[PDB]
């Protein structure tokens, strides 16, 4: 059995306090506690330390230490406003099974004034209370599938916890209830693996076996009776895995009401891997103002030790954070880019690293712009010239219109002359920028009651600038 420091069965601290739970063993010791990221875990050869600088009511719970090859302490953080630490807001059991509602009391002093309330009063319910575990509804009936709250008498007033929803399932006939952990496994040749196949039933008569590629394994079974149910567990421990261990593992359970099966695939690999891919082309073109999501799929073993998104791109280096992810050997990393501004064009690199090395995938994001037009009057070698500058992506074309009267837009009736410049002089064509084109119109004599409009077009839209001297 491992040894805990402090050597007490229970401990009461105030919110804000520093807590240090040290477990020491002959060999390696393993802690298993309910909250994180609250606790900072330090672990060496002989010991493991659970630590915190700021104790929260959420730190309340039982902390069990085990030596793989048991000891426990209960921590109470007595929050004067929070008497309850709710571990789960959803509890599911079968009918005639005892249901535990994980309402963790933050002050042991409060126990005798504690009551279970049904959001509010229940009907014919048999319950007991544990300061360490919460309320237990004995032999749960179908009618007891409701929303409950835990009351604590603080200063003569009732203080409720957050609702706990109880779902009591009807016990219908059928093959024994199945369990197969893990759902998936990946190991490198030479590593250790554990595959646990278990089955439960309300009746003791049932069979369970673990099959590897349709070949039944000789696993010794550990039969037990827990919470009005009989269980049979098959623990498969592989000391050092090899390509012979890989494949389909089936957990098969049967009784007089049927034969049942559940599966998992065990993959054995020669070395650590890290593969990055995208369903998207790395070259991206979107219109300014549009939203875009850049997604990378990561298949990696062992677990990633680091990952990020970096803006390499030519403009201001505002770095992502933006970045979200879903799924553990498979992960999708999504960089969200809503209502894209022009400084957000450029290169975005996704990097991931694990024991196998590092990998990166770089996206190139080019933005499309409708034309922006500017017209000015200048003199090129003594001659009067109207200069039209049009900016946009893709490259725009230019059109000049001369029309009678002063207007913002020359109309078919007022238009006197039209000049087309489909391919004007390319002034600037840098990557992740607008292309700027220039058209020059030499005007020999410019009259009064007239305006010169320059219109530019590309696939995204049109721009215009009318010049009146």
């Amino acid at each position, epitope marked *: 059995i491992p040894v805990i420091e402090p050597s007490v069965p229970e401990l009461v601290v105030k919110p804000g306090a520093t807590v240090t739970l040290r477990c020491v063993g002959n060999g390696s010791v393993e802690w298993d506690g309910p909250p994180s990221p609250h606790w900072t875990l330090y672990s060496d050869g002989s010991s493991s330390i659970l630590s915190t600088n700021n104790a929260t009511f959420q730190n309340t719970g039982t902390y069990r230490c085990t030596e793989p090859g048991s000891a426990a302490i209960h921590l109470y953080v007595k929050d004067p406003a929070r008497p309850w630490n709710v571990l789960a807001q959803e509890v599911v059991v079968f009918e005639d099974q005892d249901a535990l509602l994980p309402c963790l009391l933050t002050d042991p002093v409060l126990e005798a004034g504690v009551s279970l309330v049904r959001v509010p009063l229940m009907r014919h319910t048999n319950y007991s209370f544990s300061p360490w575990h919460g309320f237990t509804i004995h032999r749960a009936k179908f009618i007891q599938s409701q929303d409950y709250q835990c009351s604590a008498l603080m200063g003569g007033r009732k203080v409720m916890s957050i609702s706990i929803r109880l779902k009591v399932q009807k016990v219908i006939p059928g093959p024994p209830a199945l369990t197969l952990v893990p759902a998936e496994l990946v190991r490198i040749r030479g590593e250790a693996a554990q595959i646990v196949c278990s089955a439960s039933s309300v009746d003791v008569n049932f069979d369970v076996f673990l099959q590897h590629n349709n070949t039944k394994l000789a696993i010794p079974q550990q039969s037990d009776f827990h919470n009005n149910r009989y269980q049979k567990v098959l623990t498969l421990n592989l000391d050092q895995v090899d390509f012979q261990h890989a494949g389909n593992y089936s957990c098969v359970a049967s009784n007089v009401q049927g034969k049942h099966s559940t599966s998992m695939f065990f993959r054995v690999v020669e070395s650590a891997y890290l593969n990055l891919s995208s369903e998207q082309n790395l070259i991206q073109e979107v219109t*300014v*103002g*549009e*939203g875009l*999501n850049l997604k990378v799929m990561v298949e990696a073993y062992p677990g990633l030790q680091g990952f990020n998104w970096t803006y390499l791109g030519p403009f201001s280096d505002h770095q992502p954070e933006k970045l*979200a992810n879903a799924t553990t050997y498979r992960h999708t990393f999504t960089l*969200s880019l*809503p*209502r894209l*501004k*022009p400084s957000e064009a450029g290169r975005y690199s996704f990097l991931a690293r694990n024991p196998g090395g590092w990998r990166a995938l770089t996206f190139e994001l080019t933005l499309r712009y*409708p034309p922006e037009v500017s017209v000015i009057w200048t003199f090129i070698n003594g001659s009067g010239t109207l200069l039209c500058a049009a900016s946009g992506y893709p490259q725009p074309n230019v059109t000049w219109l001369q029309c009678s009267g002063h207007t*913002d*837009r020359c109309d078919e009736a007022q238009v006197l002359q039209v000049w087309d410049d489909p391919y004007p002089e390319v002034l600037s064509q840098e990557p992740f920028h607008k292309v700027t084109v220039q058209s020059l119109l030499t005007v020999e004599t410019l009259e009064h009651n007239q305006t010169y409009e320059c219109r530019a077009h590309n696939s995204v*839209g*049109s*721009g*215009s600038w009318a010049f009146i001297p």
Partner: antibody
Amino acid sequence: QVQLVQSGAEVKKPGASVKVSCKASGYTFTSYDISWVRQAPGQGLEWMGVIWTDGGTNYAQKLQGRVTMTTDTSTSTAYMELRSLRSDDTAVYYCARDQRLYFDVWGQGTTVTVSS
Amino acid sequence: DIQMTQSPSSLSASVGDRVTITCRASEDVNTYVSWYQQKPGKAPKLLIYAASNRYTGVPSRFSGSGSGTDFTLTISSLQPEDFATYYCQQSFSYPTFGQGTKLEIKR
């Protein structure tokens, strides 16, 4: 305190242009983008475009080439000009502070009537 | 453009009632959804942004939920001021609004 005050009601003939003003107070005007949203009588809200803090603009595709958004840093005033007016441009025009992911501060609106 | 479909188009409720308004986006808009309240002759007012984030000075009876394409706005206990038009807006791409939900007094 934190407000955008818009110019008064406008009446125009089809083919004319309208230039609506929007003056900021209670905050650093140059620190936030400005969007213009329009609402036709008895209808929903329609985004017209944004002017960013840098001077750049992004117009709604339906108004591209016809709308101009500008700002005056000295007077903390945003402007919106809509040309080649038609009957269906008759709406209430709002300027709003564009925080990209929401419009937190709105102007009181400017009624624009386009009729012959 | 992303279409924002509001449900219902009209709602009758009484002071004290719990009211739910739903909104569906034609494509995934993450949590870039806002809720506005508009009364006749007045400009819209921001209620919720970032799908569930309440704006400053907005009462606790107003709440938002949703991710991806389906969003909800909940008014837990209607007050006489709450009767107005409510619009959902997406800000993932070019801003677009739902057609509105008119909330009126059931009598």
